[model samples]
Every structure is written in C-alpha cells, then in structure tokens.
Target: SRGAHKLVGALEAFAIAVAGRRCLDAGASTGGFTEVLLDRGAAHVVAADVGYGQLAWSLRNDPRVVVLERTNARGLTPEAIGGRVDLVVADLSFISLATVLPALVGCASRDADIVPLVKPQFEVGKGQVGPGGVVHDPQLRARSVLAVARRAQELGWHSVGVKASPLPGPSGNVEYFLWLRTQTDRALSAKGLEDAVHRAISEGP
Candidate 1:
C-alpha cells in the first residue's frame, strides 16, 4: 500500500468506478493501486512495472493480478496484456507520460478511462526543477500537465478532468492526476486546468 492513499481520494474526485472492471496499473510498484483496485472490486488487474520483485508478495500471488515484471508501459499493447482493459491507472517515475501516452491509449478498450499521475518534475525542463527536484511554480506545473493532456487530445482522447494528487510524489514534488478518456462529450478548458492547479496548490497538502 505504498501509494494507495494517492489513489483512494482520486477515485471519488475523478468519479472512477472500479467495480467489475478490468484494469491495468502501470508502474505498479508494491501494488498499492492494484490492492486498492482489488479491494474495490476490480475483476482483474494487470500490474506491470519496469522493475522486478518490487510488487507486494500478496498482490503478486493474487489470482486477479497479472504480474508483468520488467514491463515498460511505453511498449504496452492489448495482446501483451490479456485483452483491452476498461481502466488504465499509471504512476510512473523518471519519464514523461507523453512518451507513453499512445501505448496506454492503444491498450485500452473503447471508452476506457485513464488516470495518469503527472509528475511535473519529469515533464518539464531540467533547469525548471528545484533543489529537491520539485517543480516549485504552480504555473509551470499546470502547463506541464496541460501539455500531456493536449497530447492525449491529439491522439483522440478527451481530457475530462485534472486534480492535484492527494499525496505528493518523491522528494515532496507536487503532482497532478490527469483524467483522460477515449470518448467524452465534455472536455475541460485551459482555465479549468489552471484552476485545478491553483485549488490544489491552495488546498494545502
């Protein structure tokens, strides 16, 4: 449950309904999100991570979880997993989601929901990061997230929502949760994205 809290609050905030859905938890370190998905009634979870032997023992053994160790999310495909999944949840480190967005989208079923934990520290230029690798400027943070959101839009996704993660990432870096979907009638405006960053920043960790 290392990063479970980061997802618990996001579920309700983003209106993600996990019950009975097939999920793919990218960067499933320690299986925090996988555990939450199983606890909340997900039918199956493909817990894929670049590192091996880091998933919790229980989750690795769980029948509902398909452990894909040393798997890179950037190269994911529907057949690579059992089939197209209904939901895709990612909490990646050291790489921008932009580089992996297409792979995530291609692996999902039509109308699937995607929630990527957007770490601004990896999304922005190196010089913009602070002493502890935190993107200190909220504006820069929002822009970084928006860039990813827009990239998804260009790839046929609709950006539905954005929120500050309930928990900070490594080194106390502020992060945002970006909600994307294959199909949606409504999409967030640029102001909506900026406002969420402001509220998340003002809401106090």
Candidate 2:
C-alpha cells in the first residue's frame, strides 16, 4: 500500500507536468491512478474496470470521476464513454497491454495520448516466466517491453517514450511506463523499439 501510494504521488506530478486533461483510467483498481488524475486537475476521469465495487470511496464519490464497472478495457469505445478522451492511463494485470491498447486508442480523441504500465510477467510467454509468475531475467523483460512497443506502433500509435516505473510491481518485478500518441501513420522503427527497451532497462531507476 505504501508503494502504491508513492506511485500515485509520482503519477500526479507527471499528469500536472503534462497539463491535466480529460482522461480515462483503465483497470482503475482502488482508484490509485484515477485519484492522481483528478488531483492533478483532470477535467474528467472515466474509471473503468472488469470488476465492480473496488474503487476507493473518495474517488467513487468525486463528481469528476465516472465509474464504469464491469467494463472490459478491450471493448472500450467512444460511445461507452459518451465521447472521446484526451488521455488514457492503464494499469492492468495478468494480460498484455497490447491486447487492449488498440481498443483504448479507438476510444480516444484523434489527438489522444496513452500512458500504459508495461508488466513483463504479463507480456512474456508463460514458459518465459519463472516461479511465482515473476520475470527476473533482464533480457526477457527487455524483450517483453519491446514486444508491446512494437505491437503498439504497428497498430498506428506513435511511440513517444518508455520510462521505468517509479515503483515496481507487487512481486518486485520491474515495470515500465510507455508513452504513445494516437496517429494515422506509424512513426516507430524496429531499431527505435530496441533502443527504448534497452534504455528503460539499463538507464531506468
């Protein structure tokens, strides 16, 4: 909980720096990510998740927060949110972000940007993971991040950057934050993806 709280604080700062805007929080468990959006002055935040009744009371009660319970991020659409969103922040588990990013992009405005948390344990193949579902191999983790980044670019998003998460996952697995901009044309290259993953793993703290 302490680590999650600290992550919330960092996210809040990042949102403010990016200039708070109307946003969507996918897999918004306990509203940690949603809380950061609102605290940073997001115009509105649509908190969606496959589960219900798990949002924090403060966020559930906030007028600026709209709870979309029992909603799958992969099926998200503009109509589902009543309109397009300016930004989408995802922190999903047990599934690869690549699977849901395309749908999330469809729900965004033409200029929408995304910041998805990349967890290698979910991105890599089952056999690549070790005991306890943790991905401890650095090369495997780098490959996992690259896989997601490449997939996103192929789906028409401009991969802007990849940064190491300020906090690790619950199992101490290192995670990353990927920045993508919705675009009609792709702007990423194989070399770029490789470089980003290497930088995130080697230079990230």
Candidate 3:
C-alpha cells in the first residue's frame, strides 16, 4: 500500500474523480486530506477544522484552498460551504458521521460523494473502545462501520462501498472508510449492511 500519510493519496482511489471537483474537508487539521485533493486536480477545497491555526502552511498559501478555521462541521450549510460542493472529505474525531450527517449532506449538491475515515474508537459506546481509545475487536469494528453506513442511508445516501483503511488509527486500532453516493441511487438493505460489516471485519487494516 502507498504510505498512509493522507487518506486521499494513501487510499489512492475513490468512488468519484477528484479532477475539477469542488471539495470540502471536514476536520482539516494540517490539511493532509486537502493536499491530496489539490494534487489530484481538484478545482477547489474548503478546509474546515474546529481548532484554530493547525492547518498546514502549504495549504494556507495555496490559492485553491479555503481555510475555514475554528468552524464546526455541525454548523455547515451549502451556503457556508461556499455553495454546494462536489465532494465531501472527512478525517473527524470524537464526532460520528451520524452527529454531523445533516450538516454535511445539507452542504453538498445532489449525489455528492463522501469519503471519511471511520474510526471505530469514537463509534462504540463507553468501554467498548479499549485501551488508547482504540476499538480492537473486529466484530465491534464491523458493527461500527455498518452503523455509520446505515445512518448515512437513512439520510438518503447510497452505500457505494465500505472498506478497511490502509493503516491503523492513532492507538493501532484498525480503521475503515465509508463511501456514500449521496442524494441519489438505491439504499443498501439490512442484509447487505451485515455483509458489508463482515467484509470490513475480514479486510481491516
């Protein structure tokens, strides 16, 4: 696998093309995600992060990057996002996609693709995530991924794919990516979600 420094580069592939796309990066700390988008020829990127001043110097200076520092994803709107974006990218922590689901989907155009690092550490209930804020059990990890997918589906997104990330989370917990073909297409069924869950478990980083 490519070096896991950034999701877009390391993942090296996505359900949608980045070329000429207008993208948004949630939790844009240090701009790892945004750098990849620009590198892949994205026309523009709106980088939003809760914390102030953690963005990369390169991204801050790049004309294509819009640094929305000190902004919360929950507060996002299509207008706030500087008009409906073509794609949504996230590397959020502590907040589940479920929590920010409406804001994110609300801020994008129809059928906008969303690719996020689904860290199970914050998905599990209290104590389910073990030492170092990691979710170790493959079953629980799969369950977490399935939960996010189902949530996105309920919000009218199509579950295009779910897969293990190329690298582990901060504490060495295996992570996954949730791809949503938002606002268009058929939703995955319960059986399919379970199957995807199993696939996640079987294929985790």
Candidate 3 lDDT over residue span 24-94, tens digit each: 98777655677778877899999887765577677678999888755578888877768988888777777
| TM-score of structure candidate 3 | 0.89
**Model 2, 29-60: lDDT tens per residue?**
65667766676678888988666547777777
Give candidate 1 regions above 4 Å deviation. none
Listed in order, each prediction's TM-score against the native is: 0.93, 0.86, 0.89
16, model 1: CA deviation in Å? 1.0
Query: How does model 3 fare in lDDT?
Result: 0.76
lDDT value, residue 145 of candidate 1: 81
Candidate 1's error at 95, in angstroms? Answer: 0.3
- Candidates 2 and 3, the one with greater TM-score: 3
lDDT of 3 at 130: 80
Instruction: Give the number of the best model, judged by TM-score.
Output: 1
Ranking by lDDT: 1, 3, 2
Clashing pairs in 3: none
Which candidate comes out best when scored by lDDT? Answer: 1
Arrange candidates by TM-score, descending: 1, 3, 2
Which scores greater on lDDT, model 1 or model 3? Answer: 1
For model 2, the stretches where C-alpha displacement exceeds 4 angstroms are 1-20, 183-189
Candidate 3 residues lying further than 4 Å off, grouped into runs, are 1-6, 9-13, 183-187
